[PDB]
Amino acid sequence: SMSVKKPKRDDSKDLALCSMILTEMETHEDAWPFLLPVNLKLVPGYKKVIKKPMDFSTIREKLSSGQYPNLETFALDVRLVFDNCETFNEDDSDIGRAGHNMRKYFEKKWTDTFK
Structure with missing residues (x-):
């Protein structure tokens, strides 16, 4: 609250690390x-x-x-890509499977990098 702050989590590398994750997703075969x-x-x-x-x-x-x-608005747009894919594509389609695979891939990189 006013003049009462939790300790400052270092966010100065978040831009670089989100860019690295995004590169890895861009280069995945699926x-x-x-x-x-x-x-x-x-x-x-x-x-x-x-x-x-x-x-x-x-x-x-x-x-x-x-x-x-911030890094949470970045994760929201990545998840949106996969949530859209699930809305429009059957689970048993190539694109449907691609979206499940990529979401799994992303969520691991996210956890390993930031949690």
């Missing part, structure tokens, strides 16, 4: 469904159904331009 924004003209249903589209290229641009105020 990242191909997530690299670029879904083409809203060519994928029926996507525009109406997926209220907040998100992809790794869009995260990378946001990261590079100071649009994440």
Whole structure:
């Protein structure tokens, strides 16, 4: 509260470490469904159904331009990519499986780096 602060958790490396994680996700073999924004003209249903589209290229641009105020807003956009994928894709599809694999991969890197 006013003039009463918990000790300062060092956040000075968070930008670098989020960028490293994002690189690792970009280079995973199963990242191909997530690299670029879904083409809203060519994928029926996507525009109406997926209220907040998100992809790794869009995260990378946001990261590079100071649009994440802290590491939790970064994790929220990564999870959004996989939550969108689950909303639109059957679990037993290549893209559905890709999304489960990537979410697992991300959550381990997240825990190992920051928890």
